[PDB]
Write a protein that binds this ligand. Structure first.
Ligand SMILES: [Mg+2]
Ligand SMILES: [Mg+2]
Ligand SMILES: [Mg+2]
Lengths: 134, 384, 196
RNA sequence: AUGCCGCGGAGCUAUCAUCUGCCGGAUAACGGCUGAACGCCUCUAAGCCAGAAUCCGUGCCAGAAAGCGACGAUUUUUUGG
RNA sequence: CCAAGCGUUCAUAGCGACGUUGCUUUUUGAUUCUUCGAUGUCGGCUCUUCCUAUCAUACCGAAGCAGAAUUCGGUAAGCGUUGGAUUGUUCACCCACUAAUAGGGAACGUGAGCUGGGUUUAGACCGUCGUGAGACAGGUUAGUUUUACCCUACUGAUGAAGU
RNA sequence: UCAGACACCAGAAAAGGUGUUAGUUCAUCUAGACAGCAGGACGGUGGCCAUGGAAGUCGGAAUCCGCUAAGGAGUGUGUAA
C-alpha cells in the first residue's frame, strides 16, 4: 500500500509457511512467511505472495538478534512462473525477499541476485539497491 | 459460522441442457427512428482462437504505449441472405407476429432447414408459395402493406451461406434479425428490396465496436457437485466418496431445497456474453487478411495446417477479443450492444501489430510456409 | 332480475372486493361474466398501503421450490381473478366450472367493445367510498409490481374511444331523426292516455 | 496384472491460464415547495419534489410438457385424401 | 417511564441512584404432558437458508475550524464477515491480515453425510474410598460407526395426444 | 408506512401523541382578550465591586422611588466599550 502506484495481478507463488532466501546483507538467511499484506477474506484460502508483495515474516536462520520477531519483507524473486502483460511467462531460480520497514525502506544495504521489475517499480528503495533488474 | 459466499449463481437455473443449439436473441436493442435502417444481429461460425500483439493506447496505464498480447476468437462470417420479413404488432399480451412475407426464390440450403431428410423428400417446401409470387404479385404487396399499417416491430428472415464454410452440414441456419432505424414503412421497404440479397458483416458491424455474443456452451455431460458447482472436496477419509456435498439440508423444511448443489448436467447451456470488442473485420477477398501496418507479410487468417477441427477461413471474419461460448464450428449469434459505451477501454481505437498464424496443432514455430522453407533450407523430400 | 347468458361489466370505478363478491355469486348462479377494463378498478386505501399488501403477498413462496410456490400474477385482470377465485370453492368441480365462466381482461378488446357494458352499483366507488377517502387504481398498482402493458393498453383505449365517439355521434344523429318523426305523429294522443 | 525413464501432439483442465459482468421506476430515513388550522409561525392538513447497497422492473436463465401466434407442405394419376 | 444528581456554567451533549413498567434467555433448574416391543449422543468438517438485536459497505442526523473521533447513532440484512498457535471442545485468549473480522435460528440445522478427538461404562494402571466384592464432584491407556435396491423431495433425462 | 374484526383463546404493560373527536377548570375578555400591530419604555443611575474599555445589552452581589397609559438595575440585536 502506497509503494509507487499499482501492480498487475501476478501468479502467487509463496503461500503462508513458505520459506524464502534473504537476498540482502541484513544478516538474515531464511525468511518464513507469516502473512501477506492486502489479503482479504476467503474461507480456507491461504494468503500468498508474489514478487513485489509486502509480507510479514520471521527469520529462522541468521543473526540471533533478527530472530524471534515479526518483520515486514518484500518478495523480489520467485520460482512460480507468472505472466507479464506483454505475454511473457518468466520465473527465477529461487524465492527471495529483503527485510524492509513498513514504509518500504530496506533494512540492509545491498541485494544479491536479480530482482523482478514489478518489485523494482513499486519499491524505489529496492530499485536503488538492486543490481540487475529482470 | 465461518461465513463463505454460496457456490454458483442462482441466476443460471435450471442447469438443464439448452432447448436449442443456434443461440437466441432474447432482447433486441431499443429502436431509434432517427437513425438509418440497419440490422441488429448476425450469424457466424466459430473457427478457432489465436493471439495478437498490439500497442496499448491507454493514458494513465503502466502499459500505455507498450505492447500487450491478447487472445482473440475468429468467427467466420460469410454474407447472410435476406429471404423474408416478419411484422409484429404491439399488444397488451406482448408482441404478436401478424404475418410473414417470403422471397420468391429460396436457395436449397435454406430449404433444407424445413426438412429432416431433404434428400428423400419431394422438395415441396415453398413451391405453391412461389407460384403465388408470379401469378399477380398482389397478395405479396398486400401482406407488406399490412406490416406498414400495423406492426411496430419489423424483423428480416436471414440465413447463412453455410456451404461457403468447410462445415459438413448443408442445412443453413435461419434467424429473425430485427430491423432498427427510421420508420416502419422504411423498414418494410428496406426488407423487400433485400429479398434474395446478401448482407455482409461490414454493413452490420464496424471496427472497434462493442458487441454481444450469444451461443450454447460446450457440452459436458453430467458432473458431480465438485465440478458442477465448485464445492469443496471432502476429506480423503470420507466413506462413500468425497466429490459431493456433505449436508444437503436441515430438518425442517423436510425437503431438499432448490438452492443446494446437486450432481447433474454441467454444459450445453445458453449464454449471452457481453462486451466483446471487434479487433478486425477481415475480408475474404484479400490475401493480406492477417497482415498489419507493422507486419507486411502477405498472409491470411488461417494458421499453418488449418484451423484445428475447422479448416481454412476463406470468407469474411471477425476477430473478437477474448473468448466466446461454445466449441469450434458452433454457430454463434453476434448482437448489437444494448448498453452505451463511453469508457476509455471501450472507446479506444484498436490497431493490431501482429497476428499469430503458427500451427495450433502443436508447438508451431513458423508463421508461413515461406518462413519454414527458409529456416530449414532443404530436406530429403524437397530435393526430389 | 338478470338471468341473461352473458353480461359484460365495465370494471372502471368499481371496488375490487365488492365487485369480486358480486361476480363470484353470479358465476355460482350460472351466469357467464366478462369483466373489461380491469386496469381501472379501484381499491380503497392509499397507494402505499395497497402496494405493501402486494409486496407481502409476493414474499410468500415455497421455500424448497419456488416454482411450486404461490404464483403471483401482476396484471390487473389477474389481480381481479385472484379476488374472485378466493370467493369460490375453487378446489371443487362446481367452483372450477364457475371460475371458467369468468373472462377478465385489460382494456376492452375487440369482441366486447361493440357490446353493451353494464355496471354494478353495489360495488361503485363513488357510491361506496366516503369522499376524501384515499383510494388507488389497480392499473397503477400492477405497473409498479411488474405488469408491463400500461402504455399499450392506454394507447389502444384512446383509439377505441375515438371510434366509439364516432359510433355514438352517428347513433345520436339517427335517433334524432326518429324522434322528430315520432313527436309529429298523430297517434301520440292515444298513446298518452296509456302512459306512453 | 500399464515393467521403468525423457519428451510427448490431441483432449481435458488451472484465481497455475485467458475473456466478460448495466440502467430505469417506486420508496425508507431524512430534507425542501405551495399552503393552513391555532387570523402569526411551521416539510402536512390535500398535494408536489428530492432521496439509500432497500423494493419492483428492463437486462440474464428456464419457458406453461393441459398458455399462445406467424408461416411452409399437405399420403398422388395404385390407394388414401 | 421517573429526575435527585455528574457533567466548572446547562437536571435528560454524553453519564444518571433510589423506584417502577416490559422483552428475551441459547442458564441451569421446575414439572413430568409425548417417547422405555429403541426418534443414534458432543465437537469439527461440509452445505444451504432464514432473523436483526448492524462489525463493514450505501445514504442520512447532532454536538467544535477544518482534519478527524463519538453517537452506527436513523433507514437498511442487498452484499461481505478471513489465515493461524491453542482449547477434544462450546466458550475463550493470543499472532496476524482485513473494509470488517457482528450476533443468532433452522429437532442446542447438519452421523443410511463423514470423522470419531469427546462421551464411549467389556481389558488395564493410579489416587482417594471400601474388611471385601467393589466405588468415584476423578486422572490415564486400548477399544467393530451397519442398510436405500421403496415413497416423496431434490438434481438432471425421455415422453402419449381429443383439440 | 404493524388498523380492526367477538367470550373461553391462543399475548400484553408503565408512560406518552401539535393524531382525531367531545367535554371541563383557572381566567385575558365593549374597561377594547390573543396573533397580525403602530408606539412609547422619563431621570436619579453610568445601581456598588469588577478594568486596558464594560454607560442594561461580557462578570460578582442585590430588585428602589415622583409622576404618568407606560419604566425591571432587564430578552437581545450590534458595539472596540
Ligand atoms: Mg478451514
Ligand atoms: Mg472410514
Ligand atoms: Mg493446439
Amino acid at each position: 500500500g502506497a509503494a509507487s502506484g499499482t501492480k498487475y495481478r501476478m501468479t502467487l507463488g509463496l503461500p503462508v509457511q513458505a520459506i524464502m532466501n534473504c537476498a540482502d546483507n541484513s544478516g538474515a538467511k531464511n525468511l518464513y512467511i507469516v502473512s501477506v499484506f492486502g489479503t482479504g477474506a476467503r474461507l480456507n484460502r491461504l494468503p500468498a505472495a508474489s514478487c513485489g508483495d509486502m509480507v510479514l515474516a520471521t527469520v529462522k536462520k541468521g543473526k540471533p538478534d533478527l530472530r524471534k520477531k515479526i518483520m515486514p519483507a518484500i518478495v523480489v524473486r520467485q520460482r512460480k512462473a507468472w505472466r507479464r502483460k506483454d505475454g511473457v511467462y518468466l520465473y527465477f531460480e529461487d524465492n527471495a525477499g529483503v527485510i524492509v520497514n513498513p514504509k518500504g525502506e530496506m533494512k540492509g544495504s545491498a541485494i544479491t541476485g536479480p530482482v523482478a521489475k514489478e518489485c523494482a517499480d513499486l519499491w524505489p528503495r529496492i530499485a536503488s539497491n538492486a543490481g540487475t533488474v529482470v | 459460522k465461518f461465513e463463505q459466499p454460496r457456490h454458483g449463481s442462482l441466476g443460471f437455473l435450471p442447469r438443464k441442457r439448452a432447448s436449442r443449439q443456434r443461440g437466441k436473441v432474447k432482447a433486441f436493442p431499443k429502436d431509434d427512428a432517427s437513425k438509418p435502417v440497419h440490422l441488429t444481429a448476425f450469424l457466424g461460425y466459430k473457427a478457432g482462437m489465436t493471439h495478437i500483439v498490439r500497442d496499448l493506447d491507454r493514458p494513465g496505464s503502466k502499459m500505455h504505449k507498450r505492447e500487450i498480447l491478447e487472445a482473440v476468437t475468429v468467427i467466420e462470417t460469410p454474407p447472410m441472405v435476406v429471404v423474408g420479413v416478419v411484422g409484429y404488432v404491439e399488444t397488451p399480451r406482448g408482441l404478436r407476429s401478424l404475418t410473414t412475407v417470403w422471397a420468391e426464390h429460396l436457395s436449397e440450403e435454406v430449404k433444407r432447414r424445413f426438412y429432416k431428410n431433404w434428400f428423400k423428400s419431394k422438395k415441396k417446401a415453398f413451391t405453391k408459395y412461389a407460384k403465388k409470387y408470379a401469378e399477380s404479385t398482389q397478395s405479396i404487396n398486400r401482406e407488406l402493406e399490412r406490416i406498414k399499417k400495423y406492426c411496430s416491430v419489423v424483423r428480416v428472415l436471414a440465413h447463412t451461406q453455410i456451404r461457403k464454410t468447410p462445415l459438413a452440414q448443408k442445412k443453413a441456419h435461419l434467424m429473425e434479425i430485427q430491423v432498427n432505424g427510421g420508420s416502419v414503412a422504411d423498414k418494410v421497404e428496406w426488407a423487400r428490396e433485400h429479398f434474395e440479397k446478401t448482407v455482409d458483416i461490414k454493413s452490420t458491424f464496424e471496427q472497434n465496436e462493442m458487441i454481444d455474443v450469444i451461443g450454447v456452451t460446450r457440452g459436458k455431460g453430467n458432473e458431480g457437485t465438485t465440478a458442477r458447482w465448485g464445492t469443496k472436496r471432502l476429506p480423503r477419509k470420507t466413506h462413500r466418496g468425497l466429490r459431493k456435498v456433505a449436508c444437503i439440508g436441515a430438518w425442517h423444511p423436510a425437503n431438499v431445497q432448490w438452492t443446494v448443489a446437486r450432481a447433474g448436467n454441467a454444459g450445453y447451456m445458453h449464454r449471452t456474453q457481453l462486451n466483446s470488442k471487434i479487433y478486425r473485420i477481415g475480408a475474404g477477398d484479400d490475401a493480406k487478411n492477417a497482415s498489419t501496418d507493422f507486419d507486411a507479410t502477405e498472409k491470411r487468417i488461417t494458421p499453418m495446417g488449418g484451423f484445428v477441427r475447422y479448416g481454412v477461413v476463406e470468407n469474411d471474419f471477425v476477430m473478437l477479443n477474448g473468448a466466446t461460448p461454445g466449441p469450434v464450428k458452433r454457430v454463434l449469434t453476434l448482437r448489437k450492444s444494448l448498453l452505451t459505451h463511453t469508457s476509455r477501454k471501450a472507446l479506444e481505437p484498436v490497431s493490431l501489430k501482429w497476428i499469430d498464424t503458427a500451427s495450433k496443432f502443436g508447438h508451431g514455430r513458423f508463421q508461413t510456409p515461406a518462413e519454414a522453407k527458409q529456416f530449414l533450407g532443404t530436406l530429403k523430400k524437397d530435393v526430389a | 332480475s338478470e338471468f341473461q347468458k352473458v353480461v359484460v361489466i365495465d370494471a372502471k370505478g368499481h371496488l375490487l372486493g365488492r365487485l369480486a363478491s358480486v361476480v363470484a355469486k353470479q358465476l355460482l348462479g350460472g351466469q357467464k361474466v366478462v369483466v373489461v377494463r380491469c386496469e381501472e378498478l379501484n381499491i380503497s386505501g392509499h397507494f402505499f398501503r395497497n402496494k405493501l399488501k402486494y409486496l407481502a403477498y409476493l414474499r410468500k413462496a415455497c421455500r424448497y421450490n419456488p416454482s411450486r410456490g404461490a404464483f403471483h400474477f401482476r396484471a390487473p385482470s389477474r389481480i381481479f381473478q385472484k379476488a374472485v377465485r378466493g370467493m369460490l370453492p375453487h378446489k371443487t368441480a362446481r367452483g372450477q366450472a364457475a371460475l371458467e365462466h369468468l373472462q377478465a381482461v385489460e382494456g376492452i378488446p375487440p369482441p366486447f367493445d361493440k357490446q353493451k357494458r353494464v355496471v354494478v352499483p353495489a360495488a361503485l366507488r363513488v357510491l361506496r367510498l366516503k369522499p376524501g377517502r384515499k383510494y388507488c387504481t389497480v392499473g397503477r398498482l400492477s405497473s409498479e409490481v411488474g405488469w408491463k402493458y400500461s402504455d399499450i393498453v392506454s394507447k389502444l383505449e384512446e383509439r377505441r374511444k375515438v371510434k366509439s365517439a364516432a359510433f355514438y355521434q352517428a347513433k345520436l344523429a339517427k335517433q334524432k331523426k326518429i324522434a322528430s318523426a315520432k313527436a309529429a305523429s298523430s297517434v301520440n294522443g292515444k298513446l298518452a292516455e296509456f302512459g306512453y
